[PDB]
Structures are given as C-alpha cells and as structure tokens.
Design a protein around this ligand. Structure first.
Ligand SMILES: Clc1ncnc2[nH]cnc12
Length: 280
C-alpha cells in the first residue's frame, strides 16, 4: 500500500523486482517480493552497511509474504558489459570496480557474511563511478535458469561448509569476464561447469588441493586435463592482473587470496576512480 510500482524490473533470483516510489517519502527504491529464521537472518542484514553494498532499507513481512526494500541503482554490470562489447571496459575502470568490490567483500567477510551467489547481474553501478554488491546474504537466509558460471569448485564438488573464499572465486571469474568480454567458465550443467574449470586450470589433485579426492562429489574417473597459462586465458591483461587473478582462482580455498590481502596487491598501486559513460 505504501508504494507505487513504477515498472517491473524483472524476475530476480528470489522473486519479482519492482522499481517503486514510496508514497510517504517520495524515495524511489527497488522492491523485491520474496517467493522465521529467515526473517531474523534477513533482519540482521539491515545492519550490514557499507558504500559498496546495496543498502537494505527495510524488510516488510505482511500477509505472510515478504518484501525487501533496497536502494535503487540504474544499471548493472551485465548490461554495462553488453553495452561495452565492441569496445571493452577501459582497464582503469575495470581496476576501480574490482577494488571497490573487494572493499565490499572485505567488509562483509570481516563480519562473517558471505554472498555465495555473486554474478554480473548482482553488481549494480551508478553515475558517480560506484559499483555495489546486491542480494548480499540472501542465499543463506532463503537458500538458492540459475547461473553456475561463477560457482567455486568446492561448491560444485558438494562441500557443505564452504567459506568466504567462494566469493573471491566468483569475483575472479567476473574480473576475467570484464577483461575478455566473454564469460570465463560458461557451464551449462554442474559437470560441464566443473569440466570447463578443469580444462582451463587443470584437473585438481591432492598435490594442488589437499583433501580434494575426499570431497562428496569428487570422482576418481574425472578426466585428467593439464593446466593452461593465464596469458592464454585473459589476454591482454598485464602481469600484475594475471598474478592477482591466478590467486583468486587457486583451487584450494585455503590458499585462495582473501579480499583484504587482494586490496594490497600491486595491481592496485595505481588505482583511480573513473566515471563511467552511462545512458539511463
Ligand atoms: Cl535488481 C535492482 N535493480 C535496481 N536497483 C536495485 N537495488 C537492489 N536490486 C536492484
């Protein structure tokens, strides 16, 4: 009752998203209609505020249906990439976005909150050059065609107790996609996703990932592929970038770089904040 629905933005991971106007403040928001532990978990996310996290304005439980009211941003990274397809995103903008995302992740991760489902459609961008993580923490609160392209290998191999490393893996994949203008691992099934990772990074074994062979969905029968070079996977990215991406894509989640450690990487020595070129 307190909103006017302006337009259907589309059908997100958990239900429909609407651009809406608050009838008692005039503020324009994103309203997600979600299709009691969940209420408590979600309610805690109202406190998780950071400039690179899309702000959860409010949570409204009524007719025992659930509405999440979020800060509105006019574009996402998926559409920005599609619109930059001919030309590519300039490196300093790639670098700025990656840095800001890592700040967001470092913040949530220092509170033990993970995203678990990062994807370009979840990264929202404004006119001032800011990029922000949307739907943060909703996977744990509500559980999760859905995209597998960004999933870490420990999730695909059936680990129940994965860690903040899963987000760094996703963000690596998005980094590589910004650079190349093609998804890194566009699997169309769980095994196709796994085998696309293995074809690129080599089939993992006990040498690179202690314990891998005891994971729930690991099979001794997986084909055995050798690793390729990152010079072939993300050209023409420079050696700092490739060094960072390689650390974000380590098979072992314990050796994978943390968001905080990544913010200190030399790739970011010369980071700036450009303003993107955006048509709304
Ligand atoms: Cl899907 C979407 N679109 C625009 N703004 C948003 N804020 C949170 N989700 C959003």
């Amino acid at each position: 009752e307190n909103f006017q629905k302006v337009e259907k933005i589309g059908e997100g991971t958990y239900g429909v998203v609407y651009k809406a106007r608050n009838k008692l403040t005039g503020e324009v928001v994103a309203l997600k209609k979600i299709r009691s532990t969940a209420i408590r978990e979600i309610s805690l996310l109202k406190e998780l505020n950071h400039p690179n996290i899309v702000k959860l304005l409010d949570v409204i439980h009524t007719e025992n249906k659930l509405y999440l009211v979020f800060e509105f941003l006019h574009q996402d990274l998926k559409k920005f990439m599609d619109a930059s397809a001919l030309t590519g995103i300039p490196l300093p903008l790639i670098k700025s976005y990656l840095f800001q995302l890592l700040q967001g992740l470092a913040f949530c991760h220092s509170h033990r909150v993970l995203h678990r489902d990062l994807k370009p459609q979840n990264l929202l961008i404004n006119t001032e050059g800011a990029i922000k993580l949307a739907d943060f923490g909703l996977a744990r609160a509500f559980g999760v065609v859905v995209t597998l392209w960004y999933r870490a290998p420990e999730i695909l191999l059936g680990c129940k107790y994965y860690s903040t490393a899963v987000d760094i893996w996703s963000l690596g994949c998005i980094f590589a996609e910004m650079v190349t203008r093609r998804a890194l691992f566009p699997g169309d099934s769980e095994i196709d996703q796994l085998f696309r990772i293995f074809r690129t990074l080599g089939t993992p074994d006990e040498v690179v990932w202690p314990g891998v062979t005891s994971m729930p969905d690991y099979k001794p029968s997986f084909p055995k592929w050798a690793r390729q070079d990152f010079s072939k996977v993300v050209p023409p990215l420079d050696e700092d970038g490739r060094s960072l991406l390689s650390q974000m894509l380590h098979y072992d989640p314990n050796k994978r770089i943390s968001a905080k450690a990544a913010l200190a990487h030399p790739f970011f020595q010369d980071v700036t904040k450009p303003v993107p070129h955006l048509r709304l």
